[PDB]
């Protein structure tokens, strides 16, 4: 098992001696490495042309949050409120009150990307699969107050992307 | 009276103008369970907690509202707070009285 890195030692044979001496005086390995970077000059550059091209991702990838509707057009969220109860950063805050119809609903679902750690526990937790960690990954913004999403904001994110998200979940759920 | 107030960095305000409130917690009555009931704990008194002007969050000032500590014996708890030089409100363990039960007493007549 155990292996000796090094430990191997140079021969004192005169051909070898002259070789190492000529190596020192004439810099063989030096020019070797130099030739190596020469060799990497000729390979095709790895850069992608962002924005105009964008890097590969995955169906499972996590990003901006977004509550989302039934196809019926009704919202999914039902305030079982355990999204609050499982987020380690406890970013989420929820305050449900009854619908006039009598159905359970949120009044001010909110979240703040300032504290959220994008761990995707909320994505797992929801029994009705309401909140979803959306594919979008870019929403850097000027002002701190914008980070602190309101419920309406999440819905708008759910409106913007719904075909996309439904596509990911469609492509992914079997592995769940 | 092993006072250690100088050793703790705690500001004088909160070894002074507030009190601990030792008790063995009551059973949640919705529950029929008994487990969480036992073992002394050392809750502090509540102070002010207003509201965030933005987003409506319950912003809060007091340094140590959420603190709470389990114990095995009450004397140990009182002595504990005494070591801290703490004001306290010890409360009795209030075990339910044992009660007679009989399925057949339902069928007296």
């Amino acid at each position: 098992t155990y292996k000796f890195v090094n430990m191997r030692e140079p021969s004192m044979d005169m051909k070898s001696v002259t070789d190492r001496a000529a190596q020192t005086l004439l810099w063989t390995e030096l020019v070797r490495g130099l030739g190596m970077t020469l060799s990497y000059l000729f390979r095709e550059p790895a850069t992608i042309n962002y924005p105009f091209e964008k890097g590969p991702l995955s169906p499972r990838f996590r990003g901006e949050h977004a509550l989302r509707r039934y196809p019926s057009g009704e919202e999914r969220c039902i305030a079982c409120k355990l999204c609050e109860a499982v987020c380690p950063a406890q970013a989420i805050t929820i305050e449900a009150e009854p619908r006039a119809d009598g159905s359970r609903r949120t009044t001010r679902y909110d979240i703040d990307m300032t504290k959220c750690i994008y761990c995707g526990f909320c994505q797992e937790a929801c029994p009705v699969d309401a909140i979803v960690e959306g594919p979008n990954f870019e929403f850097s913004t000027e002002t701190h107050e914008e980070l602190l999403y309101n419920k309406e904001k999440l819905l708008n994110n759910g409106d913007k992307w719904e075909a996309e998200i439904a596509a990911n979940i469609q492509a992914d759920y079997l592995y769940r | 009276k092993l006072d250690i107030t100088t050793l703790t960095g705690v500001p004088e305000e909160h070894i002074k103008t507030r009190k601990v409130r030792i008790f063995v917690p009551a059973r949640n009555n919705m529950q029929s369970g008994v487990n969480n009931t036992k073992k002394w704990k050392m809750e502090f008194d509540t102070r002010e907690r207003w509201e965030n002007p933005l987003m409506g969050w319950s912003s809060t000032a007091d340094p140590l509202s959420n603190l709470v500590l389990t114990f095995s014996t009450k004397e140990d708890a009182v002595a504990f707070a005494e070591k801290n030089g703490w004001s306290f409100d010890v409360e009795e363990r209030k075990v339910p009285k044992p009660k007679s039960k009989s399925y057949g007493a339902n069928f007296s007549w």
Binding site: T107, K151 | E51, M55
Partner: peptide, 18 residues
Amino acid sequence: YSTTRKKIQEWVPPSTPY
């Protein structure tokens, strides 16, 4: 912005005298 309306809705004195 703030969401979920109000809290205490405290009452106020009547316009009418006495």
